[PDB]
């Protein structure tokens, strides 16, 4: 369970690990 989160815009600290759908908006599952 690595520190990961879902957001529309992922900064350098959070690399793209996958994709998630929240509130119809396309969220990116980014982690480090």
Q: Are 27 and 6 in contact (CB under 8 A)?
A: yes
Q: Are 16 and 28 in contact (CB under 8 A)?
A: yes
Q: Are 31 and 4 in contact (CB under 8 A)?
A: yes
Of the candidates 3, 23, 26, the one whose C-alpha atom is nearest the C-alpha of residue 15 is 3
21 exposure class (CB count in 10 Å sphere: 0-12, 13-18, 19+): exposed
């Amino acid at each position: 369970r690595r520190t990961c989160h879902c957001r529309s815009r992922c900064l350098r600290r959070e690399s793209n690990s996958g994709s998630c759908n929240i509130n119809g908006r396309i969220f990116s599952l980014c982690c480090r």
